[PDB]
Ligand binder design. Structure first.
Ligand code: CHL
Ligand code: CHL
Ligand code: CHL
Ligand code: CHL
Ligand code: CHL
Ligand code: CHL
Ligand code: CHL
Ligand code: CHL
Ligand SMILES: CC1=C[C@H](O)CC(C)(C)[C@H]1/C=C/C(C)=C/C=C/C(C)=C/C=C/C=C(C)/C=C/C=C(C)/C=C/C1=C(C)C[C@H](O)CC1(C)C
Ligand SMILES: CC1=C[C@H](O)CC(C)(C)[C@H]1/C=C/C(C)=C/C=C/C(C)=C/C=C/C=C(C)/C=C/C=C(C)/C=C/C1=C(C)C[C@H](O)CC1(C)C
Lengths: 33, 137, 216, 217, 218, 218
């Protein structure tokens, strides 16, 4: 059982801005991305 | 990253016992080779030949692997616990923990040196100077 | 409770007052447009933005002025403890000190503090128009995104009444914040001094204690 | 050796008859419910939820009583190395110096300490009931997820005995803290301080010396 | 409201997911909280429902009973030891006691006789409460009614069900606050108004942390 | 009497409706009193019958053992310590714990060796009370049989059922009177006959209100 309260899922990838896009040569295969 | 976080911890544990800051660790053993307050028989000329020969071959053997992933995370003998050797999702968050401890290490060690250039004080001696005036004032 | 047609209005038990264009699906609608400032509904949209930014800057504006006499009278040695004389802390030789401690920020001149100040709010107030690295296509008033981490803005009926709790906390904040400018120019001391003054003498430390202060 | 009817019980080889509702299925099952508190199969779950949280909160507690006084004996100038005197360190002007070091934490306002603890522990015990960004829908006691990073709980076979080792170490720690509260009220000394006095002369520095401590009138 | 699934909870939305199957919102005060789980036996839970309301109604009598000497002694009326954990000890004085200020009042002198009146009066009422008698014989043991509700407040069932929850929430404050009153008197050693007389002047120091070192031994 | 549904109860005429229906009178001591409702589960109630009986059988030994070194001290024979709640302290004296005043008697010296044999053999019987051993294996864990009845008294099962009720009632006296002994001794600090002789001396001052203000807070 679960309940989403006190936080938000954000459906995303946690980039270094809250909303920008990913550069093309970087793909999420590496752990530090 | 791996040299940095192995050095950031070593910049404190060496100070927390001896009281010699990492900045002034040079002259204090140029005269006498000590470690945890116990003397050691090596001249500093002997220390360099031991250093260059030994850590040379490690940095030569590290340059012997040809796979670009296996040059990063070799494992094998270097993973005796076999933690990140299986269970690829469980190994992945282990790898994200090393790079975050790598990125935080390099900034923290670049933190030590710049404030040691200004103040001339070490890792923890330049910490107490900030808490000196912050507590009283 | 504060929405819909059958809501309480600014006159309370009266119902013949509101100027019939508003319906009450927006937080704090009491129909109080007696002078008719916003009968144009497109014009009425621009005030609702303009009230809320006035509401949010005055809520932190009030909290940004209670503390230096709250902390300063109760054991915190500031540089200067009154909010409407606080701007003179930069004038001194040692500069202003955050919480009276000189080895902090320790700002000295004016040629750099407002030099960076107009550029930071030159961007983020312009990010409120559009753009901004926190979210591009969003609502201009209640965007969500990385401004609401806690997820309290999710239950929309509960979210609509937190908006009511955002404006009612804010409308009495703005009404209080105008009250901060008035009693400062008349009396000349900080407000918790005036709290200590009124509890000392309730009858005659009132507004009539200095009603003859502006006599020509 | 640990589950089923061929498990050990609280009386061992001479155990005779355990209670009926203890089948050798769950950890720590030594059949010791002689007063019969948990005959209800629903309420017996609630105590297993409640024994373990007491068990985990007591195993980490024992390294908060033994461990500062132990470091104080080996050359660390603590403010108060004795654990029941440790709260009074915030009311002296030196403040709560972590490890006796002034350039560490240095707490001054005691009401600001728990002023932020309640916001955290409130949000962190409420995560244990439900939700939480770590593990959303998971087990109430053994989630794994990112509470188990190393993966010592991978196979379901070995996972049963680590649950046994969690609770036997756990019940042993809870035994010592019904201890730890008595030996501080009685002696007024640290727990290893009582251990240092017992090794000097055992036949005299035992609890029968304090047998007349609560004598009336 | 206050009943069913959409009612009030114990941890707010945090206890909304985990709630016992026997705690559903039928009875007043079901915030859904049995973290020991000891009420899954329903007739045993029936007894703790009884024990909660009984410990709340006898709470609310002594709730205001421990403050009415204190705020009236300073409001002008003369009292002899108007402190509730010592106001029962006033009978050892040879002048006995006053009911407000006078010996012309009820004027108890000997305490051995006043218990003989005391025990036999609740010897019947507590038996009347559990069995019946002159004030009814066969009604609800938790809400009897017309022999003690003449005023008609308990008539409308949509109003009466809310008055159920109003009854124990005024009592769950009362059961909690006098659990204070015991402890705030053992630790400090004065009346709760006189504790507040220290907390209104100096809130920062005069609180419970000022006496935190009181019970530590040597 | 003391059996059947027509038994007499904990309030007599004020208790014929509050009795839970599982309380019949088939057990010794069933007096219609489960007001807190702790034992609605009968198998749970089965364990509390053991907890009532074993507490009864230890208190009946415990009542007389506090008595016989106190009245017989007034019979002309000194007992070293005449007070019960410091009677354990006399093992640390110069002659140690004499059994009675003769040093040619038991004459206990070493406190560790007293506890040594004690805790090892009490674990056998209190473990043999669970499974069995010398005194039988599959008997009743409450009333085993003629192994503990050397005088043939455990026959005539109607008289034997009468002696069961007389076994717990004399226990419920003793459990209540051992409950008395510890309280008056941490108030007054005297043996219960030494408390009795002074209430026999002056009954007016020597009520329970003699030290009502003894534990006042400051
Ligand atoms: C390769 C890593 C390495 C680095 C970074 C240093 C760095 C240093 N050595 Mg060291 N050493 C290093 C390896 C070795 N040293 C020595 C033996 C000595 C001696 C005898 C002395 C030093 C001293 C110094 C300091 C000289 C500059 C200064 O004043 O600090 C300020 C400048 C920085 C901290 C810049 C750091 C750059 C970046 C931001 C980080 C500096 C902290 C001298 C000293 O200062 O002692 C008092 C000294 O006398 N070193 C040996 C022989 C075993 C080494 C082996 O490889
Ligand atoms: C049924 C009676 C009832 C009446 C008559 C009112 C009327 C009012 N309500 Mg309302 N309410 C009433 C019931 C209720 N109100 C409310 C909730 C609210 C809210 C939240 C608010 C109001 C506000 C108002 C005001 C709206 C008009 C205004 O702003 O006047 C303003 C103008 C005046 C009052 C004239 C001033 C008269 C004064 C004597 C002039 C003084 C002269 C100067 C001293 C001279 C200057 C000297 C110079 C030269 C130095 C007005 C006072 C608003 C308000 O008060 O904002 C400030 C407001 O925000 N009401 C509730 C709860 C739902 C009610 C319950 O029944
Ligand atoms: C990413 C850079 C960025 C920065 C530094 C700011 C800075 C600020 N914005 Mg802004 N904004 C930024 C992006 C954006 N804003 C806005 C639209 C708004 C609005 C409508 C408001 C702000 C407000 C604020 C303030 C309060 C921060 C907050 O809400 O905490 C919340 C998060 C955790 C506590 C602060 C001055 C508020 C304000 O101005 O009040 C003083 C306000 O009402 N911003 C948009 C368009 C959606 C952005 C796009 O990326
Ligand atoms: C509502 C109309 C009203 C107006 C315009 C005034 C204005 C005045 N009062 Mg009066 N009062 C008014 C009602 C009341 N007053 C008082 C009690 C007092 C006292 C105790 C005192 C005054 C004083 C003053 C004077 C201002 C100080 C000064 O130096 O004057 C010179 C300045 C001017 C004449 C500038 C005129 C004001 C300017 C045009 C702005 C005003 C704009 C509008 C009035 C709208 C403002 C908001 C409205 C809705 C309230 C001035 C005569 C003081 C005084 O006499 O000192 C000399 C003083 O001590 N008043 C009471 C309580 C019974 C009132 C009841 O409603
Ligand atoms: C066959 C012999 C055997 C006996 C007699 C026991 C007996 C016991 N085991 Mg078991 N075990 C035995 C075999 C084994 N046990 C275990 C594993 C365990 C575990 C893990 C545990 C037990 C526990 C227990 C206790 C259960 C009830 C209790 O809490 O008593 C408590 C009451 C008494 C012992 C009597 C009263 C205490 C005291 C001796 C009286 C002395 C009087 C004071 C000096 C007076 C103080 C003065 C005033 C001020 C009051 C009891 C000590 C439990 C335990 O440790 O409880 C603490 C427990 O957790 N056993 C194993 C391994 C498989 C065994 C192997 O054969
Ligand atoms: C929750 C666990 C906890 C416990 C049991 C204690 C108890 C203690 N604190 Mg501490 N504290 C605890 C957490 C905290 N304290 C403090 C802040 C302080 C201060 C400022 C001081 C203390 C002091 C003390 C000591 C009082 C001496 C004493 O009790 O006499 C001897 C008697 C005993 C040790 C018996 C204790 C057993 C306990 C009563 C039963 C255990 C169950 C508890 C009721 C559960 C705790 C609360 C529940 C509801 C969660 C004692 C070690 C004082 C001190 O150290 O001076 C010498 C002191 O000045 N504490 C904070 C920050 C707000 C805490 C965070 O939660
Ligand atoms: C999201 C942030 C989050 C954080 C920082 C914590 C941290 C904590 N949890 Mg919690 N939890 C969190 C979310 C959740 N917890 C739980 C379920 C539990 C349980 C069952 C327990 C804890 C316990 C603990 C505490 C002991 C540290 C630990 O577990 O070491 C492990 C990690 C690294 C060594 C600590 C307060 C334990 C506790 O409180 O006992 C002392 C405990 O038993 N948590 C759930 C439901 C799956 C969560 C939802 O996301
Ligand atoms: C109709 C009259 C009648 C009354 C009033 C009672 C009364 C009682 N009988 Mg019953 N009986 C009665 C008829 C009969 N009884 C019995 C046979 C029995 C038996 C065998 C037993 C009882 C028991 C009881 C008690 C059960 C409830 C309880 O636990 O009390 C709880 C409530 C109180 C004791 C009153 C509260 C005390 C007072 C307010 C406290 C004093 C305050 C101090 C000054 C200070 C307090 C400290 C502060 C500071 C914290 C109760 C006292 C049981 C018993 O013996 O319990 C003692 C029991 O075993 N009765 C028979 C023969 C069939 C009866 C014939 O009619
Ligand atoms: C099972 C059974 C069976 C039968 O049949 C019946 C019976 C008998 C009833 C039962 C039994 C039971 C029991 C035994 C119980 C016990 C418990 C315990 C003791 C717990 C502890 C428990 C304990 C606990 C929690 C504890 C915890 C602790 C802590 C946190 C601490 C903390 C701290 C520290 C670090 C130190 C510092 O200085 C401070 C503080 C802060 C103070
Ligand atoms: C629910 C639950 C659930 C889960 O699961 C588990 C658990 C946790 C266990 C649970 C909980 C519980 C609780 C909390 C309880 C509490 C209670 C109380 C506190 C009561 C009080 C209670 C209290 C009370 C009665 C009190 C009362 C009082 C009184 C009458 C008073 C009297 C008086 C007066 C008039 C005055 C004068 O001058 C004197 C005197 C004489 C003094």
């Amino acid at each position: 059982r679960s309940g989403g309260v006190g936080y938000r899922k954000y459906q995303g990838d946690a980039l270094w801005l809250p909303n920008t896009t990913r550069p093309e040569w970087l793909d999420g295969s590496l752990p530090g991305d | 990253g791996r040299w940095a976080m192995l050095a950031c911890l070593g910049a404190l544990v060496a100070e927390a016992t001896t009281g010699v800051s990492w900045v002034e660790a040079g002259k204090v053993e140029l005269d006498g080779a000590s470690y945890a307050g116990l003397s050691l028989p090596f001249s500093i000329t002997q220390l360099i030949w031991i250093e260059v020969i030994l850590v040379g071959g490690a940095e030569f053997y590290r340059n012997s692997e040809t796979n670009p992933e296996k040059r990063c995370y070799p494992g094998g003998v270097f993973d005796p616990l076999k933690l990140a050797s299986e269970d690829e999702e469980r190994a992945f968050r282990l790898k994200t923990a090393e790079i975050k401890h790598a990125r935080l290490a390099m900034v923290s060690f670049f933190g030590y040196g710049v404030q040691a250039l200004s103040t001339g004080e070490g890792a923890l001696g330049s910490l107490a100077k900030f808490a000196d005036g912050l507590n009283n004032g | 409770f504060w929405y819909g047609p059958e809501r309480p209005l600014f006159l309370g038990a009266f119902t013949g007052e509101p100027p019939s264009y508003l319906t009450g699906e927006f937080p704090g609608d009491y129909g109080w447009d007696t002078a008719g400032l916003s009968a144009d509904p497109e014009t009425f949209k621009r005030y609702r933005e303009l009230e809320l930014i006035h509401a949010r800057w005055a809520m932190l504006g009030a909290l940004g002025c209670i503390f230096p006499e709250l902390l300063g009278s109760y054991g915190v040695p500031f540089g200067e403890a009154v909010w409407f004389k606080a701007g003179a802390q930069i004038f001194q030789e040692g500069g202003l000190d955050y919480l009276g401690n000189p080895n902090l920020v320790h700002a000295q001149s004016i040629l750099a503090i407002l030099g960076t100040q107009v550029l930071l709010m030159g961007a983020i107030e312009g990010y409120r128009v559009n753009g901004g690295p926190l979210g591009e296509g969003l609502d201009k008033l209640y965007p969500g995104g990385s401004f609401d981490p806690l997820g309290l803005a999710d239950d929309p009926d509960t979210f609509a009444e937190l908006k009511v709790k955002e404006i009612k906390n804010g409308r009495l904040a703005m009404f209080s914040m105008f009250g901060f400018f008035v009693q400062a120019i008349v009396t000349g001391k900080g407000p918790l001094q005036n709290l200590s003054d009124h509890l000392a003498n309730p009858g005659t430390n009132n507004a009539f204690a200095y009603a003859t202060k502006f006599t020509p």
